Amino acid sequence: DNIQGITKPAIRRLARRGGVKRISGLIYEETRGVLKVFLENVIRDAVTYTEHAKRKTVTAMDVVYALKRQGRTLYGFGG
Amino acid sequence: DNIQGITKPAIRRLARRGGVKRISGLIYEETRGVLKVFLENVIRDAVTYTEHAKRKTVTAMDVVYALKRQGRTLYGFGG
Amino acid sequence: SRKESYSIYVYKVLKQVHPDTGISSKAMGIMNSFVNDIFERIAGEASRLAHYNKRSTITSREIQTAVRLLLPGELAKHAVSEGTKAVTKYTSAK
Amino acid sequence: RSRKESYSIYVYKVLKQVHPDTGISSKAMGIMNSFVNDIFERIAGEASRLAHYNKRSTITSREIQTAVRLLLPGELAKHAVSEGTKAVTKYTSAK
Amino acid sequence: PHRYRPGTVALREIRRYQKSTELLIRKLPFQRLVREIAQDFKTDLRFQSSAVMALQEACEAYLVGLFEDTNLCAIHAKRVTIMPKDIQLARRIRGERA
Amino acid sequence: PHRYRPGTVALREIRRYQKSTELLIRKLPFQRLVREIAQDFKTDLRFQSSAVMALQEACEAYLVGLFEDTNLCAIHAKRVTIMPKDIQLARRIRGERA
Amino acid sequence: TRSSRAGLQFPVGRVHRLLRKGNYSERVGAGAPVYLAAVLEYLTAEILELAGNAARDNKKTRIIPRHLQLAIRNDEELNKLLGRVTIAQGGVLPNIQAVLLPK
DNA sequence: GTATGAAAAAAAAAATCGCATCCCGGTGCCGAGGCCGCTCAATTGGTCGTAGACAGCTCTAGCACCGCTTAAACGCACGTACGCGCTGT
């Protein structure tokens, strides 16, 4: 149950950065749920890359390759 | 000026198929404008495929290859 | 010239699943395109899978892993199977 | 150690050609690095298809161009199509 | 006379068009439009009568596809009429502009 | 005493966070969460300290990216507070659900 | 044939050829084409199976495009797969959002 | 500003009436199924070379320890605007 470790205010911040002025108390849970979905979908693949390579350690590259696959490509970790 | 050839009611239909009950008189023009943008963006590439092949005629395939490129892939004309 | 297809294979499979049901030229052409896409999607993911791990040889293993990623859970499972089944059956049929 | 190649050295020369009196961060460099590989791969890819679509086994300067036209927006492509064509012509004449 | 209340028809019109698959834009006007735009990029161009339809297909299905989302926007605003700002919003989120 | 009027802060808070690039989620809780989800697909897994960050980055930027769209939805409804149904609407149009 | 050795309909051969001539890698592990050919066959079937059910539910012998669409779109899984995909004469699943309905 | 009547007009229920969709024949004709002849690509079987399998050594780089101070989280509660519902061109 580390999902709650994503703290109410920590979300507040993210949303603030988006350009959010006011935030329903329901949001926080909703957001958590979404985040889970996101990471899961990603990591699943990311891991599945790792599973193929015969490595028990996950590399940054595995992460990227997955992010790229999931159409949310990432620069700064050497794609 | 064939853009108007896209008739008020012809749009009515499309929107109806979308699941639309009521439609601002402004929409029709808005829609036209959008459609233009779409075709243009597409055809441009579609042509540009043709331009590569050394053909003065555009094929269905050229259309598809472009639609695929533009992330609106089409089944039912091969490829 | 000879414009190839999959149209003939579709038919055999149709009759294996619904013997007493036909299909339209337009739908066939669709099914045709459907195949080529997924083929290309898989091949592609596989080609990368290979190129990522410094291999020049795409094996049955690479295909599988690709499929796992490209297909949703239940669909992939049923496929992973019908794959594995098709491999095993060929390595034993010489 | 391994021998992980980069573009990092070329970036520098280009930086100095455009803004001599401006440096850059490891993090931004790594970014620029990734940027290159992507577009490279995007172009290569579109080109590989361009080839495979037209029953060719040889990707030429022509294929690259057509790819660029498709991948890049108008003004960007134009300025590139040029700086390409310019780089081709200049090499075929320099023997 | 006898006259159905505003909407009730549309609602029918939807059931009808939802159920059918025919192309809803008139073939020629479109065909012509395609060519008119063709000229802008190169002249003396011919099109496969299949290529034409091919386009028409994706356009309608796209426009329909938009209107689907479009309406969901108008609805979210407690409304029932779609207004430019709905399409605009949709297209933004979609990523067709900014 | 002295109190700034509701919102005025948020408004500041935005200017601040918009302007900065630092990661807004706490590193460990996240790192831990990543592992908790890791276990679901395979156990006894290790992560490159870079891979962790790599994830964190895309997440925040995505969540920010969502909230951007999210808010535009709430706004379109003449509102200023975001409500789940805004995210939901956004995600639908985006194509993250149906 | 190889196709019969696996017991598949799909032409494990033509795949193998398509792969070497495809520019997907240098070398293609004779296993691969089998696995793939099957996968395709399955997907092909999973759809046809569903389409065939829609056809019957229309009182038609012959599957048209609309069927394929209707079939794909009502299965959550197939849908997700064919997300950024358009189908010729596909129409759309009859859905009118309740607040539009009258009274 | 509370219990009778009352009452008058928007909201719940029937009977005209009509207009538009489904089902069942029943009319035609095309484009789906299976025969045909013809090429190529699928199969077979040798020849070679090199990818990948295997086991091993080298050292990076994740996991785990600590105990401190510190900013982030947690909460509580007091009061403002912000959303939600009603009403009328």
Numbering used by the authors:
A (entry chain F), B (entry chain B): 24 to 102
C (entry chain H): 32 to 125
D (entry chain D): 31 to 125
E (entry chain A), F (entry chain E): 38 to 135
G (entry chain G): 16 to 118
Copy out sentences from the published article reporting this entry, exactly as the authors wrote them:
Eukaryotic DNA is packaged by basic proteins into chromatin, which consists of repeating nucleosome units composed of a core element of ~146 base pairs (bp) wrapped around an octamer of four different core histone proteins in 123 left-handed turns. Here, we present findings from cohesive-ended dinucleosomes that self-assemble into lattices composed of fibres with uninterrupted Watson–Crick continuity of the double helix. The offset pairing of dinucleosomes in an open-ended fashion yields uninterrupted continuity of the DNA double helix from one end of the crystal to the other, making the lattice like a fabric woven of chromatin fibres that are interdigitated with one another. The chains assume open configurations, in which the DNA path zigzags to form two nucleosome columns on either side of the fibre axis, permitting dense packing of nucleosomes by virtue of the staircase-like fibre profiles that foster a key in lock style of interdigitation.
We obtained nucleosome fibre crystals with two different dinucleosome constructs of 349 and 355 bp that differ with respect to the lengths of the linker DNA. Fibres of the 355 construct are highly extended, having an average rise of 42.5 Å per nucleosome, with the dinucleosome repeats situated perpendicular to the fibre axis and stacked edgewise one on top of the other to create a pseudo-twofold symmetric double-sided staircase. The 31 bp ‘shared’ linker DNA sections that connect the two nucleosomes within a dinucleosome cross over roughly orthogonal to the fibre axis, whereas the 34 bp ‘paired’ (annealed) linker DNA sections that connect adjacent dinucleosomes are aligned more coincident with the fibre axis. As such, the fibre has a decisive zigzag configuration comprising two parallel nucleosome columns, where each nucleosome connects to two others in the opposing column. On the other hand, the bp insertions of 355 coincide with double helix twist extensions, relative to the 349 fibre, of 54° (shared) and 88° (paired) between the respectively linked nucleosome core regions. The corresponding shared and paired linker arms in the 355 fibre show an overall bending of 26° and 60°, respectively, but both arms also display some excess curvature as the double helix wriggles. By allowing interfibre groove-groove interdigitation, this translational writhing in the 355 linker DNA facilitates close packing of the fibres (see below). On the other hand, the 355 nucleosome cores are offset with one another, so that there are contacts between the nucleosome cores of one fibre and the linker DNA of neighbouring fibres. In fact, the 355 fibre structure is remarkably similar to the 2-start zigzag form of 30 nm structure.
